[PDB]
């Protein structure tokens, strides 16, 4: 629907939005992984003891 | 080159128009300058 010279702006907007979404998802995953790793360490300690 | 006085605008990068489409197109990322000056007195003939 657009000539590339002006469509680049829309493509950049979409890229920024999707990249921000990916970064947010990865940060949430990192925090959740830290929590689950703490739980797993507790579970291993409980198993051993 | 020589162009119609109304076509000077078409010389800007990333622009349409007959001249910029089929005669001479600047790259979208063109880096440089454009000079255009009236040459009516030196290029206009009574007979055309």
Question: How are the elements arranged and paired?
Answer:
This is part of a larger assembly, with 2 copies of chain A.
Chain A: H1 4-48
Protein name (chain B): Spike protein S1
Region (Integrin-binding motif) (chain B): 4-6
Organism (chain B): Severe acute respiratory syndrome coronavirus 2 (2019-nCoV)
Distance linking N and C termini of chain A: 66 Å
The number of helical segments of chain A is 1
Largest sheet of chain A: none
Protein structure class of chain A = mainly alpha
- How many β strands of chain A by DSSP? 0
Rg over alpha carbons of chain A: 21 Å
Protein name (chain B): Spike protein S1
Organism (chain B): Severe acute respiratory syndrome coronavirus 2 (2019-nCoV)
Task: Walk me through the structure.
This is part of a larger assembly, with two copies of chain A. With 49 residues, chain A is mainly α. Helix content of chain A is 92%, strand content 0%. Chain A has one helix and no strands. The termini of chain A are far apart.
């Amino acid at each position: 629907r657009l000539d590339p010279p002006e469509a680049e702006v829309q493509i950049d907007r979409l890229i920024t939005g999707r990249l921000q979404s990916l970064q947010t998802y990865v940060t949430q995953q990192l925090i959740r992984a830290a929590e689950i790793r703490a739980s797993a360490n507790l579970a291993a300690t409980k198993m051993s003891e | 080159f020589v162009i119609r006085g109304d076509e000077v605008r078409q010389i800007a990068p990333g622009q349409t128009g007959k001249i910029a489409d089929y005669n001479y197109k600047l790259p979208d990322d063109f880096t440089g300058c454009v000079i255009a000056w009236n040459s009516n007195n030196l290029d206009s003939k009574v007979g055309g």
